[PDB]
Structure formats: C-alpha cells, structure tokens
C-alpha cells in the first residue's frame, strides 16, 4: 500500500541499526560457540516447521537470542532454554496462533520445566527491555520483492532461503545488517533464476549498489555453494518442499561475474 512504503522503509533502516546485536559477542561467551549457535538456530527452524510458524517468527527469535547473548553470559546447558523462550516470545509477537507454553516444553523433550521457560521469558523481556519489534531480513526482502518485473515465485522463495541460511552462521553474518543481507540474497536469487541483477529501482530506494553489497554477497555466495556440505541441513530440507517451490534443489551459479 505505497503511501507509507517509503516512510516504513526509512524507519526500519533506522531501527535495524538500534536493534543490531553485538558482532563480537561469541568471543566473550566462555562456555558457548558459534557452532553451538548454529545448532540452536537449525533446531529452531525445525521447530518453526513442526508448528507451521511464519518465517518472520524465526527471524525475530534469532534476533532476540543474539541480542540476549550480546549481554548475558550463558552456559551451554542453558542455551536451548534461552532459545525456546526467545521463540515463544517471537510467536506471541508475530503469530495469530502461537503454540502454547507446554508445546515449547515438549519440543525440548522435557529438558526444562514450564516454570523455567516462563522465567526465562521474563528474563529475556527484561534484558531486551521489551523491545521486540525488530526489523528482519524477511521484512526487507518482502519490500524488495515489490521491485520484481514481473513477480517470480522461484526468486522470492530462493531469496528467503538464502536469507534464512545467514541465520545459521554468526560468522560472518552478524557483521551484516538485515537490509544488506536481504539485498545480497535478493540479488543472488534473481541472478540464479533469471540472470537479472539488483535493479536500478532498488538502488534508488536503498542507496545500495552491487558494489556496496559485494562483501555480503561474496560471503553469501560461498554459503550457497557450500550449503549441501554444511553440518546444519534443516533449512535445505525445509526448502525442498513445494510450499517454497523446491528452491533448495536449484543449482547455485559457479560465478557471480562481479
């Protein structure tokens, strides 16, 4: 409904800077790693599938985790609890029908009690000072999709896929803002399917160019090439389904010609 499309995009651009997690945070965690984070996010993706949650809900939850972990040191035995509550909070924000608390307890295989989940919910709301309305890669892609001429469902679904893969690896994707990752993923998807490129219309909207996008784009391209070998595979599996036009089956381009 382009009467607020511009204002909204500007606003998200400002808010993504303020809601950004701290890039180096895992260095300062004594007992957890990037690779343990990779396992958490991958499981959250399955969780999202299991309960048919929105992708947006998945992106938010990750954002909540990364922000929470930017200031709170957490023991590995507790990382899955942080994640669970994060996903519950995201579900409550974003979902018409969030899963009820028991369900969240259940998908951990009764690892934590209902009381723990609810306490961690409260702790997370505190540490985040209730600031839950964070921009995601998903929110940017969705706007960028309006610039397709014409609309192509494979590109959309593929861009989603890629943006989703970026959630798994804090190194390097924590360095990049949602809007830039979305840019990269959009370009990469469009090029893979149609041969077309980041359109002039988005240069005007975003002020990003292939040049500004290159660093993230180089990374994301590697990630896309190496995706079948990645220790975490839930996202590839998820995007095999028809609902997403089987885009995880498409072959990545061997070169980007940049």
């Amino acid at each position: 409904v382009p009467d607020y499309h511009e204002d909204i995009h500007t606003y998200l651009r400002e808010m993504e800077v303020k809601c950004k997690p701290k890039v180096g945070y895992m260095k300062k965690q004594p007992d957890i790693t990037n690779s343990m984070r990779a396992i958490l996010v991958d499981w959250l993706v399955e969780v999202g599938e299991e309960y048919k949650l929105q992708n947006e809900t998945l992106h938010l939850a990750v954002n909540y985790i990364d922000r929470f972990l930017s200031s709170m040191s957490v023991l590995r035995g507790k990382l899955q609890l942080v994640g669970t509550a994060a996903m519950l909070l995201a579900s409550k924000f974003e979902e018409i029908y969030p899963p009820e608390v028991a369900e969240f307890v259940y998908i951990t295989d009764d690892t934590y009690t209902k009381k723990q989940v609810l306490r961690m919910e409260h702790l997370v709301l505190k540490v985040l000072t209730f600031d839950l309305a964070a921009p995601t890669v998903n929110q940017f892609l969705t706007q960028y999709f309006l610039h397709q001429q014409p609309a192509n469902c494979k590109v959309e679904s593929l861009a989603m896929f890629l943006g989703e893969l970026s959630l798994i690896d804090a190194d390097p994707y924590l360095k990049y803002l949602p809007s830039v990752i979305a840019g990269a993923a959009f370009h990469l998807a469009l090029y893979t399917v149609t041969g077309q490129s980041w359109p002039e219309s988005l240069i005007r909207k975003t002020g990003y160019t292939l040049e500004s996008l290159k660093p993230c784009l180089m990374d994301l391209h590697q990630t896309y090439l190496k995706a079948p070998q990645h220790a975490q595979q839930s996202i590839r599996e998820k995007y095999k389904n028809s609902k997403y036009h089987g885009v995880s089956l498409l072959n990545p381009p061997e070169t980007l010609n940049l």
Partner: peptide, 9 residues
C-alpha cells in the same frame, strides 16, 4: 525427531 534435547557435548 525435532523433540530433541540439544547435546552440546
């Protein structure tokens, strides 16, 4: 199964 306890070893 997605109902796993995560074992971070």
């Amino acid at each position: 199964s997605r109902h796993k306890k995560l074992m971070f070893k």
